Amino acid sequence: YTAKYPNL
Amino acid sequence: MGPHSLRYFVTAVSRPGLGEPRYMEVGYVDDTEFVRFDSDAENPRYEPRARWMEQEGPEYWERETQKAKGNEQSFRVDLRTLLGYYNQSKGGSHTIQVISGCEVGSDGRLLRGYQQYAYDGCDYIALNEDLKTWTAADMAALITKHKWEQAGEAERLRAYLEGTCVEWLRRYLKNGNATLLRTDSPKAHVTHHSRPEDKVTLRCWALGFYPADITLTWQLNGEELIQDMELVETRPAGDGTFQKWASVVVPLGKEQYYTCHVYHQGLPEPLTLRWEPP
Amino acid sequence: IQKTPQIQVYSRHPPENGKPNILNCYVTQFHPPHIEIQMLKNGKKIPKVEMSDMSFSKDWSFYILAHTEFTPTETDTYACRVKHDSMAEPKTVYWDRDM
């Protein structure tokens, strides 16, 4: 399923 | 069973003054969109884009939704970050896209894992084939590199890519396998069109085929006409299938010397056809 | 930078005059993603035009399919008009039943 994205 | 892949395409688009950033996530199994999230709604939720994803129950959707909403807010953040990285007005509209996914052989093993980012349609950062080190495209992307190095994130991601990603991929595969192997054979015909003088145009049509991938050729007595053969990009018919054509200019009265060839994975064997005058 | 929309206008099925069909306007290779697409019949905007969700390609460019139902005749002209930041003026592409 979908990932959690790191802040840029 | 061929290779497989599970990828997500993410778009964050700001629009200062005019509302909240429009955020979107799209999931593809073997390049078939299967789920989608669009932040432009009163109660946005993840939704099946393939009917076969409806086997998943409410818990699956809740968990996906909540992740997406967290991403969205987080992306709203990043957009501001990038204004600063790049020293830009608060005024303009900007775009962040992300592609990330995992591709596995017919034995379910990770074959390749990846994650590339783009700012305003340009490469920003990506994850090397080694799933351990990054690659910044510009100065600004190093702030983010040196930041993800110091919170150790190339590992946290590799976990997902080798772990969660592959696992779920396999689960999705089980479910939509029947409809994923789908094949639709092109139907072909040739049309005939006038040119000035003593030339005519022969156009070889392929319609209603899926997947998109196809190849059409023209042969003068069996020797392909690589040169100045005209084609259109493959295009959706709108009903799930695709269309393409190839044409060449031949001498008037010499039409029967040319053969059109159509290669598609759906065909027991490639089509061969010719301009048929009634 | 901005990418310039590329456009194709074409029926779903081989057109026969008098028979209902669907006209597509397939728009690709553009960026940024905001875009305005109208389909025109005989120089006048078509009211009911449906549009697919937007998607983007491995090179970051977006693409989208607009469509409308129609019944071709020998003399009706159809076109698709696209306004986009990358282009000083809206580009119009006429439907050619041979393409």
Side-chain angles (χ1 to χ4, degrees):
Chain A
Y1 50 19
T2 188
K4 177 201 172 62
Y5 294 81
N7 278 305
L8 292 170
Chain B
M1 73 204 55
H4 301 284
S5 70
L6 164 70
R7 357 178 173 268
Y8 285 86
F9 285 64
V10 173
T11 318
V13 190
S14 65
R15 41 182 195 168
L18 292 39
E20 286 297 292
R22 175 197 190 79
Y23 176 84
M24 178 105 58
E25 300 197 342
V26 184
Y28 295 93
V29 176
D30 296 354
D31 300 32
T32 289
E33 175 174 343
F34 77 109
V35 302
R36 173 174 291 264
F37 175 94
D38 188 329
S39 81
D40 223 12
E42 162 205 357
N43 211 307
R45 309 217 100 231
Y46 244 118
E47 310 177 358
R49 307 294 300 184
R51 317 270 288 135
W52 56 261
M53 273 287 81
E54 295 158 23
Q55 331 172 13
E56 302 296 355
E59 300 178 71
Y60 171 85
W61 300 109
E62 185 68 39
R63 171 177 294 94
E64 287 313 282
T65 285
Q66 300 308 150
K67 281 191 296 193
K69 294 164 82 185
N71 296 334
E72 162 186 351
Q73 296 306 327
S74 191
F75 276 89
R76 188 192 98 260
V77 174
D78 307 345
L79 286 160
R80 296 196 195 86
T81 307
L82 294 218
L83 296 175
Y85 287 6
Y86 290 99
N87 185 28
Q88 298 174 313
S89 309
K90 290 168 59 164
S93 168
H94 300 261
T95 285
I96 306 169
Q97 301 156 271
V98 205
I99 297 155
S100 71
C102 61
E103 28 200 71
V104 310
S106 50
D107 58 346
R109 290 285 284 175
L110 183 54
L111 202 56
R112 164 185 181 269
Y114 63 104
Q115 191 177 82
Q116 352 168 23
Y117 279 72
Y119 189 56
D120 285 334
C122 294
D123 281 321
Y124 179 84
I125 204 174
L127 192 81
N128 292 123
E129 268 309 276
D130 58 49
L131 306 169
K132 249 165 301 155
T133 49
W134 303 100
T135 294
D138 64 27
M139 268 195 59
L142 294 149
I143 308 184
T144 280
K145 177 163 163 287
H146 302 326
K147 170 177 185 162
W148 286 354
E149 291 176 324
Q150 296 311 317
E153 210 119 5
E155 296 185 334
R156 164 172 311 124
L157 176 47
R158 187 180 63 261
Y160 169 93
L161 299 175
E162 297 177 354
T164 295
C165 196
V166 169
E167 282 161 37
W168 279 88
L169 177 44
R170 213 186 271 115
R171 178 189 156 72
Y172 297 140
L173 288 186
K174 186 246 295 179
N175 298 158
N177 160 272
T179 123
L180 278 174
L181 299 152
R182 178 59 170 162
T183 246
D184 285 84
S185 294
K187 304 281 181 182
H189 73 279
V190 166
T191 52
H192 190 278
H193 308 273
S194 63
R195 295 225 59 75
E197 308 318 319
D198 53 9
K199 313 291 172 185
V200 302
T201 294
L202 292 176
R203 175 155 295 111
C204 181
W205 288 89
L207 308 178
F209 58 89
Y210 174 92
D213 323 71
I214 195 167
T215 309
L216 310 175
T217 62
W218 269 109
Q219 294 186 349
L220 173 52
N221 307 305
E223 184 58 7
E224 293 179 37
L225 290 173
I226 273 193
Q227 77 284 358
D228 55 38
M229 177 185 71
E230 178 162 41
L231 50 68
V232 284
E233 297 286 311
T234 303
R235 53 195 197 200
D239 61 10
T241 75
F242 296 90
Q243 300 178 167
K244 203 185 180 49
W245 63 248
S247 64
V248 296
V249 176
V250 306
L252 177 62
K254 288 304 179 208
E255 302 98 331
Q256 297 304 310
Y257 292 64
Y258 298 77
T259 290
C260 168
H261 293 93
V262 178
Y263 310 82
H264 181 87
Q265 59 192 88
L267 295 163
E269 42 189 327
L271 297 178
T272 285
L273 49 305
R274 290 134 75 56
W275 161 241
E276 326 257 19
Chain C
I1 190 56
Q2 294 166 334
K3 295 324 173 190
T4 284
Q6 303 302 303
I7 310 171
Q8 304 197 241
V9 172
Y10 58 100
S11 51
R12 170 173 293 183
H13 306 291
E16 293 184 44
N17 302 330
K19 299 197 176 316
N21 204 325
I22 294 187
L23 196 72
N24 294 314
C25 179
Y26 181 46
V27 191
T28 54
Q29 292 305 309
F30 59 103
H31 204 301
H34 179 250
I35 191 156
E36 329 195 347
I37 291 163
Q38 303 171 359
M39 298 182 70
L40 327 165
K41 169 183 188 173
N42 286 331
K44 349 213 90 78
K45 182 180 175 179
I46 301 179
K48 178 176 166 187
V49 176
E50 289 128 83
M51 291 223 291
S52 80
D53 297 307
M54 202 181 292
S55 305
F56 74 79
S57 291
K58 298 295 281 187
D59 73 352
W60 311 117
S61 73
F62 304 87
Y63 60 94
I64 181 148
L65 178 66
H67 67 277
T68 189
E69 289 175 0
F70 82 126
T71 293
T73 60
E74 159 202 320
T75 61
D76 289 333
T77 296
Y78 296 80
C80 178
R81 173 173 292 147
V82 176
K83 169 189 197 194
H84 183 260
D85 328 31
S86 66
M87 300 184 301
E89 232 206 42
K91 175 55 190 190
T92 299
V93 182
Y94 286 88
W95 178 52
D96 181 334
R97 78 174 49 208
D98 301 331
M99 311 227 165

